[PDB]
Amino acid sequence: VDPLVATNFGKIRGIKKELNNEILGPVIQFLGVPYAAPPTGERRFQPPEPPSPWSDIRNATQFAPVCPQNIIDGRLPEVMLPVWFTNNLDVVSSYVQDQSEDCLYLNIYVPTERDSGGPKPVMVYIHGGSYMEGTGNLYDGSVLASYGNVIVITVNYRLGVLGFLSTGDQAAKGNYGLLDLIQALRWTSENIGFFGGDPLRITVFGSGAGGSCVNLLTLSHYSEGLFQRAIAQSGTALSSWAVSFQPAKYARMLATKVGCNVSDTVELVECLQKKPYK
Amino acid sequence: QETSVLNETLRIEKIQRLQGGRYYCKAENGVGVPAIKSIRVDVQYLDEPVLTVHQTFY
Ligand SMILES: *[C@@H]1O[C@H](CO)[C@@H](O)[C@H](O)[C@H]1NC(C)=O
């Protein structure tokens, strides 16, 4: 009916969803749930910070804005993205038309029901085409959750420049997008129990660059105890496009393009932090 | 080409690519084994070159 759950950060209201299938039971959706603080201002090109609490009932009945991106045939790479994505950009475009730098939100799909009893497993989907675009909002976990009797989570992390820019030194260490994912997993571990999830059985899965993300997370000590299993579909950490080996090179090209190319890498990053994300 | 000429001299005027190949002169008289000698005629040439071009992440 009216799905309300109290988390460590406040009360959240969900929304019931019926599936177009008579055997599948309905599900509860929590859309636009903040799992970290907005990466704006001095928090741009910086690790994620925990989200701020709220005292009232926060609504989670609609997707939050997606992270900044330009997929309107803005010279995207077709060889890396899934064919279903590139062959249907008009529909895909509708999912990312509403953008904001404040985009660190996740979505939760909870089944309304089987056999063995106890806390249900949590499956966290990590999307990714080329690290520059996309959103977890494109993947409805309703059926997977309802059919398998598991909790499904989709995550939105900082993309492209905002999520991975690195100067090759301490000015900008990069991997902000990965840190958001780690932070999202942290939030899940700490709050999914309130939704009936098992933090001891968290599985991360993703396809394409999303699959690359999954493997990279398994090589980081930051993932210890966070999750227990991983599923990597058509994506690894060993492919040519999984990692950026010349971040500094591209960081300066961007800076030159926006008038921020100074000798000092620290001043360069501060200059970028003053620029509009667009 | 099917080219059997009874002549101690082989003559091909205005030779062509195809007229090239290996020729053998056979000589017999009844006494013993016929005499054979081989030679490779290697007609040479250089036609006009053809130049084509093709266009072609991101
Ligand atoms: C042999 O051929 C040459 C030219 O090919 C000709 O002048 C000559 O008369 C011929 N003689 C005989 C015996 O075949």
From Swiss-Prot, chain A:
Where do the record's glycosylation annotations fall on this chain?
Answer: 59, 261
Q: Give the UniProt subcellular location, in the record's own words.
A: Cell membrane; Postsynaptic density; Synaptic cleft; Synaptic cell membrane
- Tissue expression: Expressed in the blood vessel walls (at protein level). Highly expressed in brain through prenatal stages, and at lower levels in pancreas islet beta cells.
- Bridged cysteine pairs (disulfide): 67-103, 260-271
Q: Which domain of life is it from?
A: Eukaryota
Record's disease association: Autism 20: A complex multifactorial, pervasive developmental disorder characterized by impairments in reciprocal social interaction and communication, restricted and stereotyped patterns of interests and activities, and the presence of developmental abnormalities by 3 years of age. Most individuals with autism also manifest moderate intellectual disability. The transmission pattern of AUTS20 is consistent with autosomal dominant inheritance.
Which family is this protein grouped under? Belongs to the type-B carboxylesterase/lipase family.
Its biological purpose is as follows: Cell surface protein involved in cell-cell-interactions via its interactions with neurexin family members. Plays a role in synapse function and synaptic signal transmission, and probably mediates its effects by recruiting and clustering other synaptic proteins. May promote the initial formation of synapses, but is not essential for this. In vitro, triggers the de novo formation of presynaptic structures. May be involved in specification of excitatory synapses. Required to maintain wakefulness quality and normal synchrony of cerebral cortex activity during wakefulness and sleep.
Record's subunit section = Interacts with neurexins NRXN1, NRXN2 and NRXN3. Interaction with neurexins is mediated by heparan sulfate glycan modification on neurexin. Interacts with NLGN3. Interacts with AIP1 and PDZRN3. Interacts (via its C-terminus) with DLG4/PSD-95 (via PDZ domain 3). Interacts with GOPC.
Protein's recorded name? Neuroligin-1
UniProt source species: Homo sapiens (Human)
Q: Source taxonomy lineage?
A: Eukaryota, Metazoa, Chordata, Craniata, Vertebrata
What would be the name of the gene that encodes this protein? NLGN1
**Residues represented out of the complete protein:** 51 to 380 of 863
UniProtKB/Swiss-Prot annotation, chain B:
Q: Which domain of life is it from?
A: Eukaryota
What positions does the record give for glycosylation? Answer: 7
Location comes to: Cell membrane
Task: Write out the tissue specificity statement of the associated record.
Answer: In the embryonic brachial spinal cord, selectively expressed by medial lateral motor column neurons, some populations of dorsal root ganglion neurons, and interneurons.
User: What sections of the protein cross the membrane?
Assistant: none
Purpose of the protein: Required for radial migration of cortical neurons in the superficial layer of the neocortex.
Self-association state and partner proteins as the record states: Interacts heterophilically through its MAM domain with proteins in axon-rich regions and through its Ig-like domains with proteins in differentiating muscle.
Name of the protein described by the UniProt record: MAM domain-containing glycosylphosphatidylinositol anchor protein 1
Q: Which organism is it from?
A: Gallus gallus
Location of this fragment in the whole protein: 84 to 148 of 949
